[PDB]
Design a protein around this ligand. Structure first.
Ligand SMILES: Cc1nc([C@@H](NC(=O)C(=O)Nc2ccc(Cl)cc2)[C@@H]2CCCCN2)sc1CO
Ligand SMILES: *[C@@H]1O[C@H](CO)[C@@H](O)[C@H](O)[C@H]1NC(C)=O
Ligand SMILES: *[C@@H]1O[C@H](CO)[C@@H](O)[C@H](O)[C@H]1NC(C)=O
Ligand SMILES: *[C@@H]1O[C@H](CO)[C@@H](O)[C@H](O)[C@H]1NC(C)=O
Ligand SMILES: *[C@@H]1O[C@H](CO)[C@@H](O)[C@H](O)[C@H]1NC(C)=O
Ligand SMILES: *[C@@H]1O[C@H](CO)[C@@H](O)[C@H](O)[C@H]1NC(C)=O
Ligand SMILES: *[C@@H]1O[C@H](CO)[C@@H](O)[C@H](O)[C@H]1NC(C)=O
Ligand SMILES: *[C@@H]1O[C@H](CO)[C@@H](O)[C@H](O)[C@H]1NC(C)=O
Ligand SMILES: *[C@@H]1O[C@H](CO)[C@@H](O)[C@H](O)[C@H]1NC(C)=O
Ligand SMILES: *[C@@H]1O[C@H](CO)[C@@H](O)[C@H](O)[C@H]1NC(C)=O
Ligand SMILES: *[C@@H]1O[C@H](CO)[C@@H](O)[C@H](O)[C@H]1NC(C)=O
Length: 339
């Protein structure tokens, strides 16, 4: 017999003790080795209610990635709350590794295995595990990168779709590669992302069809963000330690619903921190071909309000709350206490 509970979790990873890469270093000192033969009990005839939007596992992972970044990614200048902090800002090795989240004795993680589970409500196919699947702490906006893919069909997630101030998490069932490079050899910050056109448009079209199911068959319209900070208006992400801000106008513009889509990007040194502290300045880009190929496995959308009297619903790429990134991977899990 069990009950929903919150407890302090621990982590497991396959980090290398000899890696200088910051994720390996953190996990080496903060996590344990993974279980090579994980046990999983499938619970017959059990219905459990889940709520991805109010899950303490999310808060706890956020606390980790903040801790990791504080120890690993110190900027030259911190601009937090009036005070200014000047530190050394050496170039580090950066590549996220899978992190597992686990329950101590007396507790178990319940895992929803329903095919098209949207993250909230009753789950019919529930199993018990000690650890989650390995989750990379990939920080980004607009597009979710290198995440897990939806099993059956594309899934739309929201705490309350009727509320437009609530972020929408689109979960893809097929990866679309995004090829981002800062070439080696006029502008050392100029960079670009390359996406297969037909692949992306086909997927976006599938996303639109899925959105119609949730919005009474109204016509779905994509638009670029209207305002806000660059971290929101642009697909921001970190590649090899470098902060990339990419223009995604070509992605979200219902013209093609063929060829390679080349998004203009720039590596920024001065960043509004996702931690919510303030602003931070980092060192200029390293030399050489800075390249990161990632799977787009999800989209963060924000819906335009004031459309109730029209047939259109307008969706713009969003983000900013990195907890949403962890929700997209932690939705099928909740912690219960065993009695
Ligand atoms: C204080 C605070 N500010 C936050 C802001 N979010 C960010 O600054 C942010 O994500 N920055 C960011 C920085 C680097 C990368 Cl690679 C990706 C994102 C929000 C986003 C949404 C609208 C307003 N700006 S998140 C947050 C947490 O409390
Ligand atoms: C998910 O399914 C639940 C019922 O299981 C339903 O109440 C809720 O509206 C759905 N959420 C979304 C975003 O489709
Ligand atoms: C639970 O998932 C299994 C495997 O996909 C499926 O066979 C079964 O029908 C699901 N249970 C129900 C009744 O939704
Ligand atoms: C990228 O996507 C492909 C195709 O789905 C997948 O096989 C591969 O594991 C993904 N790589 C990741 C998750 O980094
Ligand atoms: C992805 O999901 C969509 C519906 O959202 C479905 O039509 C399509 O078959 C899925 N793609 C694959 C290849 O599973
Ligand atoms: C969803 O949001 C709408 C619009 O803000 C609101 O009227 C409604 O109460 C919300 N639903 C729930 C379950 O709170
Ligand atoms: C990424 O794009 C560059 C050209 O801009 C190319 O040299 C490289 O091969 C690409 N990577 C892949 C795997 O397509
Ligand atoms: C349009 O969407 C509704 C649900 O909103 C669906 O029931 C209906 O079948 C769709 N229109 C078609 C395919 O005739
Ligand atoms: C993105 O590029 C387009 C031109 O392709 C430009 O009109 C738009 O202002 C850019 N967006 C941002 C946020 O700079
Ligand atoms: C994208 O992938 C398709 C196959 O799905 C291929 O035919 C096409 O050449 C690719 N397009 C680009 C931009 O390379
Ligand atoms: C996504 O996964 C690939 C494959 O490991 C990796 O090379 C790349 O750095 C990842 N992208 C991001 C944003 O970290």
């Amino acid at each position: 017999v069990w009950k929903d509970a919150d407890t302090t979790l621990f982590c497991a990873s396959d980090a290398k003790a000899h890696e200088t890469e910051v994720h390996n270093v953190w996990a080496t000192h903060a996590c344990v080795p993974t279980d090579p033969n994980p046990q999983e009990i499938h619970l017959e005839n059990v219905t459990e209610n889940f709520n991805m939007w109010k899950n303490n596992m999310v808060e706890q992972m956020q606390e980790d990635v903040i801790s990791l970044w504080d120890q690993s990614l110190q900027p030259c200048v911190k601009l937090t709350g009036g005070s200014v902090i000047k530190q050394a800002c050496p170039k580090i090795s950066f590549d996220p590794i899978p992190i597992h989240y686990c329950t101590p004795a007396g507790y178990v993680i319940l895992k929803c295995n329903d095919k098209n589970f949207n993250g909230t409500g009753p789950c019919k196919n529930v199993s018990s595990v000690q650890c989650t699947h390995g989750i990379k702490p990939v920080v980004s906006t607009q597009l979710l990168l290198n995440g897990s893919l939806a099993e059956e069909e594309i899934i739309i997630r929201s705490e309350n779709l009727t509320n437009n101030a609530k972020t929408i998490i689109v979960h893809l069932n097929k990866s679309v590669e995004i090829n981002c490079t800062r070439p080696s050899n006029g502008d050392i910050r100029k960079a670009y992302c390359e996406i297969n056109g037909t692949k992306w448009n086909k997927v976006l079209k599938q996303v639109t069809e899925k959105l119609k199911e949730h919005f009474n068959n109204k016509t779905i319209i994509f638009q670029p963000p209207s305002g806000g900070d660059l971290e929101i208006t642009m697909h921001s992400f970190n590649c090899r330690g470098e902060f990339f801000y990419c223009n995604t106008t070509q992605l979200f513009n219902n013209t093609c619903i063929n060829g390679t889509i080349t998004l203009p990007c720039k590596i920024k040194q001065i960043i509004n921190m996702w931690q919510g502290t303030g602003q931070a300045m980092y060192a200029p880009p390293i030399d050489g071909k800075i390249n990161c190929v990632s799977n787009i496995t999800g989209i963060l959308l924000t819906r335009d309000g004031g459309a109730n009297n029209t047939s259109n619903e307008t969706f713009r790429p969003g983000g900013g709350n990195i907890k949403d990134n962890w929700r997209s991977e932690l939705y099928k899990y909740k912690v219960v206490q065993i009695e």
